[PDB]
């Protein structure tokens, strides 16, 4: 499923992401845009053999199991395929654990490079 901008903002707020760990809703929508273009089925193979999955491009090296990342962990304790669902609950719950591990949203390189320090409230402006 490709979410609309306001539709994802609402679903993210629905699931407790707005101001989670102090990161306003605009930050998560902005990150989703540049990670996945709002597509839950997005996947991207990394150099190290790991793979990013879903709306927030959550990586198999640490966070989910795909059975093909030698020496990886599964700290969200989910199959990576659950991160590709039209229902964003598993991506949101895993995102909560990633953003709590010390680096905040810098864990998403695309957020640091493309959302950090910008006017992220524009990404929810006009939405209900």
User: Which CB atom, from 40 or from 60, has the smaller least distance to Na ion?
Assistant: 60
SS (H, E, C) the chain: CECCHHHHHHHHHHCCCCCECCECHHHHHHHHHHHHCCECCCEEECCCCCEEECCCCEECCCCCECCCCCCCCCCCCCEHHHHHCCCCHHHHHHHHHHHCCCCHHHHCHHHHHHCCCCCHHHHCCCCC
User: Which CB atom, from 27 or from 51, has the smaller least distance to Na ion?
Assistant: 51
Active site residues: 35, 52
Any binding-site annotation on 48?
A: no
CB of 78 to Cl ion, least distance (A): 13
Binding marks (x or -) toward Na ion, 39..78, rule CB under 5 A?
---------------------x----x---x--x-x----
Residues that bind Cl ion (CB under 5 A): 24-26, 67, 69, 72, 104, 121
CB of 121 to Na ion, least distance (A): 34
Cα angle, residue 16 at apex, residues 33 and 36 outer, rounded to 5°: 15
Tokens of 12: 């993210």
User: Which CB atom, from 65 or from 81, has the smaller least distance to Na ion?
Assistant: 65
CB of 50 to Na ion, least distance (A): 7
**Known binding residues for substrate:** 101
């Amino acid at each position: 499923k490709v979410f609309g901008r306001c539709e994802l903002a609402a679903a993210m707020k629905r699931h407790g992401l707005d101001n989670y760990r102090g990161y306003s809703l605009g930050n998560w929508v902005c990150a989703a845009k540049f990670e996945s273009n709002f597509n839950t089925q997005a996947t991207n193979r990394n150099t190290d053999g790991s793979t990013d999955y879903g709306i927030l491009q959550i990586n198999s090296r640490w966070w989910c199991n795909d059975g093909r990342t030698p020496g990886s962990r599964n700290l969200c304790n989910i199959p990576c395929s659950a991160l590709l669902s039209s229902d964003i609950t598993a991506s949101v719950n895993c995102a909560k654990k990633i953003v709590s591990d010390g680096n905040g949203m810098n864990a998403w390189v695309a957020w640091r490079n493309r959302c950090k320090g910008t006017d992220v409230q524009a990404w929810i402006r006009g939405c209900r």
